[PDB]
Design a protein around this nucleic acid. Sequence first.
DNA 1: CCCTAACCCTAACCCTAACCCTAACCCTAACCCTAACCCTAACCCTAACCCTAACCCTAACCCTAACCCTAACCCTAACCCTAACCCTAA
DNA 2: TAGGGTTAGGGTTAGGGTTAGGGTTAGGGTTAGGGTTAGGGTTAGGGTTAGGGTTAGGGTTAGGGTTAGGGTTAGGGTTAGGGTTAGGG
Lengths: 95, 94, 78, 82, 114, 105, 96, 95
Amino acid sequence: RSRKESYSVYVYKVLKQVHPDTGISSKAMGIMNSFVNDIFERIAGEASRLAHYNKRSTITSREIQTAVRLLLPGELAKHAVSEGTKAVTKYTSAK
Amino acid sequence: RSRKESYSVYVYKVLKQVHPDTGISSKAMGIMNSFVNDIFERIAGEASRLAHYNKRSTITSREIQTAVRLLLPGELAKHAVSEGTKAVTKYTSA
Amino acid sequence: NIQGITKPAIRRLARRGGVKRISGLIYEETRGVLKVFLENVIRDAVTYTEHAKRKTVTAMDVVYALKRQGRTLYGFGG
Amino acid sequence: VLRDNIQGITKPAIRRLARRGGVKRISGLIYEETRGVLKVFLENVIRDAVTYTEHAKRKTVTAMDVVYALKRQGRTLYGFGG
Amino acid sequence: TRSSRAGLQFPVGRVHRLLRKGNYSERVGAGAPVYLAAVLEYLTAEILELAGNAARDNKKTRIIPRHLQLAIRNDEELNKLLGRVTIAQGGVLPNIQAVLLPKKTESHHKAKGK
Amino acid sequence: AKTRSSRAGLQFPVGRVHRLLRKGNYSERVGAGAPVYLAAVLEYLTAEILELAGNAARDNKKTRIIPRHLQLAIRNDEELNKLLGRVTIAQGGVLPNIQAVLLPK
Amino acid sequence: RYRPGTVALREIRRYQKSTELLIRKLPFQRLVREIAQDFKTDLRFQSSAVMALQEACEAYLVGLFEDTNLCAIHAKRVTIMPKDIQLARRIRGERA
Amino acid sequence: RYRPGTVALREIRRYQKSTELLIRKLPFQRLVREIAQDFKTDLRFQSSAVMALQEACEAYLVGLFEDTNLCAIHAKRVTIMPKDIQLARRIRGER
DNA sequence: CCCTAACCCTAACCCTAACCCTAACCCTAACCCTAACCCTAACCCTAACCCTAACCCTAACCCTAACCCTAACCCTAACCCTAACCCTAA
DNA sequence: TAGGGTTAGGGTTAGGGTTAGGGTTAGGGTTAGGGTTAGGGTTAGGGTTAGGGTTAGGGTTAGGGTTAGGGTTAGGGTTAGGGTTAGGG
């Protein structure tokens, strides 16, 4: 018996946070997991490309922020950037 | 100053090997360098993807051979595979 | 096995795609296009299975070949 | 302030472009449609180059950032740059 | 845990371990995975909101692939972000063209001999 | 003897490709025969491209390689057109293949 | 008793509102195995791969039919022709 | 004195046999700078980037004109129409 | 007639035949990390066969979605002269 | 600053847009006739995992030989005049 990732508990928690009166199926969970994996792979590839182009070895939040600004269009990009900056400030202010 | 790669001397040597009566320009050299860099980047990406899919850490000649067989169509793929196997056998025997 | 795709199947596919009128050679052209696409996909899957040191084509190799060709597929596999 | 730059693409320029592309007859609104399409493409490319230059902590857009943006958009370009 | 400090629900250590194992860079930061987790959380929240809206409009209390396909094809931003994405058992939009219509009656029942 | 070019029978550098693969962070361990295979493939591709360019230059009554000859050799070969599909070459050119309808009749 | 060119919209809406499969299973599996036997013999399929390939082929055929119908509508013709699918395959970039 | 629809092939062959540039330089640079000034001001261009962008736009326009001419030929019409460029932009996938 | 592709004088025009020195490229000496092999058990893929019931194959029909001359007409680019706004180094 | 690639008024003629009717390859409903869909028997390879003895890639360390940045003029190709040869209204 091996062990798989299966991003399901966090998705269910987010769904119950935004709408506790609705649920999800196994096919929808697999679709959401594949979408999250594809987004993570694209973000990792963009960050690696930016690090190789900038002649740097480390990865900071600026690289992922620029990758999100480049992948996402406009309104979604600005919203994700604002939410990420808020989360970063909340994590920095509270150790 | 700095130092750049500039794949030019090897391309000129290959050109003189296949046709010593012709030459090359700077724009053609830059185009050939960009093409070689793009091919190398695609091969490296395919090898990394194959290594991540096969759950392995090392990279052997089989991964690059499969990447060439997948990227190249048919006749060019078979020719490149044969030339690579010949070069590998020549490097192993000597 | 090439003639397995019956005429009502292509008719239902065209009705689902929004086609209100079909000619005659459209069935044969779609059959040839599907055969070529299946040949390419099967060749890619065979190459992937040979690289993976296996014989039976699984769903993971199919997803990998679909991502390499440029058309991702969600739901099936992982 | 810069203005009247959208009408810089003259009619003979689009005529020569269509003659080079194999077009033997041009209508009327084709020039305006091609101008709008080129403007949209230039806007997208310039936005991508500006994002790349802002990520690189620079201001003047170089040829390397242009090549990177062209490769990200999906259309590689050889010869110019490296 | 980082979920009680950053105010999120997606795991950060999992993304950090995946980035360290994927061999994407030599050094992976600590705020970058938090930013990626926040972006993924916002995207998942938006997708779940769209799916819930589609399910409520379709008189359903569950999330089916049809609702996800409808919410993806309806939003212009989601269609541009996920262009060449094929969803199994999803569906298509029944947007009939203006020409593909029964049109008006010509000569009653198209008969000139009456 | 001292270099890999005299042992493998090639001219492209192998240590350069190995160093580029080690610095690109593509994998944890990069082999030694894999860079030789990549160098051989690149050498064969460069030889084929140079042969096509020389043939185009000889057909165009020229003794040099210009981007026009490279574009012509790329667009003429069906395999090179499939390998390099969406590739734009600066100062290359297009093919003057007039359609059957676009004629004075 | 109905008139032609009127009941087709009902069937179109019925096929569009449903998300079921139209292509069969045994003939598709037989064709896939016959195609795979040309390259390397002694090949097996875990059913799920054949279903994924069938779904991908269905999506590709749906997209091709949509593009052909749009091109025919633009060309002032409700019906389709082999030249329409040729123009579709030429403009889309997939071969020729 | 010649007839219409006959001397166009000579100009087409003359423009196809040449690999020179048709778009100017100063108006293109002015338009590029005016577009770049909308996002962030105080921007400079090292000429080579503008030439690369002009070459890319020329290649894109050539491809679009080729696709439009092919679609018009298939539609039994030597001339082009805005509906032809709309069909081209719709089938090609770009918006 | 009106251009149109084909041979000999030169004047700029752009690559080629050796050079040189600086980061970059291969061998040797010791070592553990992860590559394919057989010992191995049971769960999934496959072939001939009853069923009986929805639909695929042929058979007469007549009518409207298709196409080839008529005859009235208004839309687009063959010159060419005028004028103004792109194209060239400092 | 200077000069040649843009800009515009004249005009008549050739190509998209509307008309009118026929006949054939496409719809639409009906009934006699295989092939697809599950339903249900064991098995002959096929893929996964743990333990033990091996051999090629990743850890400093000096030393050399060749690839990157100048000097100059020389040798393939652009441009400058016509004279002869041929595509067409």
